[PDB]
Amino acid sequence: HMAPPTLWSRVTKFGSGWGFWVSPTVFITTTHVVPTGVKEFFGEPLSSIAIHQAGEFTQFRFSKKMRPDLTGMVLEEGCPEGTVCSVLIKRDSGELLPLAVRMGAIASMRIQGRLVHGQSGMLLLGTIPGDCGAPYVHKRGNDWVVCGVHAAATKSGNTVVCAVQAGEGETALE
Numbered sequence: 001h002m003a004p005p006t007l008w009s010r011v012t013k014f015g016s017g018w019g020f021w022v023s024p025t026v027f028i029t030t031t032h033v034v035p036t037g038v039k040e041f042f043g044e045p046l047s048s049i050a051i052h053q054a055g056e057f058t059q060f061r062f063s064k065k066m067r068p069d070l071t072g073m074v075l076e077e078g079c080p081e082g083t084v085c086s087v088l089i090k091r092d093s094g095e096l097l098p099l100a101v102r103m104g105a106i107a108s109m110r111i112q113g114r115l116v117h118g119q120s121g122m123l124l125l126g127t128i129p130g131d132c133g134a135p136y137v138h139k140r141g142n143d144w145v146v147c148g149v150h151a152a153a154t155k156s157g158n159t160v161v162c163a164v165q166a167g168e169g170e171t172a173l174e
C-alpha cells in the first residue's frame with residue numbers, strides 16, 4: 001500500500017522534527033521535538049490550544065480550523081502485533097522516505113534515561129536525527145489509520161520505536 005499525496009500533506013515540519021494533522025484541528029507529534037520557550041504554535045497562542053502530553057506522545061487540539069482542507073482520520077493506540085506499518089518520513093530536502101516496519105509489542109521502555117510508552121518494530125535506509133514525529137500509518141480497508149509518532153531507534157537502526165497515546169489494556173505489556 002502506497003500512501004496518497006493528501007496523506008503525506010498531513011506530515012508537517014515542526015520544531016526539531018515533524019508532526020501530523022489527524023484532522024483540521026488535531027496535530028500529533030513527539031514530545032521532545034516540540035519547541036520550548038515559545039508563546040504560540042502555528043501562530044495560535046498556547047492558551048487557545050488544548051495540549052495533551054503523555055510521555056513522548058503530544059497532541060494539540062486547536063481552537064480554530066488549521067487544516068480545513070482535511071477530513072478527520074482515525075488515530076489508534078498502536079496496532080496489533082505483526083501489523084506492517086509505513087513510517088511516513090519526510091526529509092528536510094523534501095524527499096519522501098516511506099519505511100516499512102513490522103510492529104511489535106506495546107510497552108513502557110527505558111530509552112535514553114526515561115520511560116517511554118510506545119511500540120517497537122522491525123524495519124523491513126533507516127531513520128536518522130531529524131525524523132522524529134513522523135507518523136506510523138497502516139491501511140484498513142480503503143482508509144488509512146495513524147497509530148504512533150516516530151521517537152527512537154537502536155544504534156544499528158533495525159529496531160524503531162513510535163510513541164503512542166496513553167492507555168493500558170490487555171494487549172500491551174504492563
Ligand SMILES: *[C@@H](O)[C@H](C[C@@H]1CCNC1=O)NC(=O)[C@H](CC1CCCCC1)NC(=O)OCc1ccccc1
Nearest residue numbers: 032111112127128129130131132151152153154155
Ligand atoms: C528523533 O529525534 C530521533 C530519531 C533517532 C535518532 C537516530 N535514529 C532515530 O531513529 N530520536 C532520538 O534521538 C531519541 C530521542 C529520545 C527518545 C526518548 C525520549 C527522549 C529523547 N534518542 C534515541 O533514539 O537514542 C538512541 C540512539 C540511536 C542512535 C545513536 C545514538 C542513540
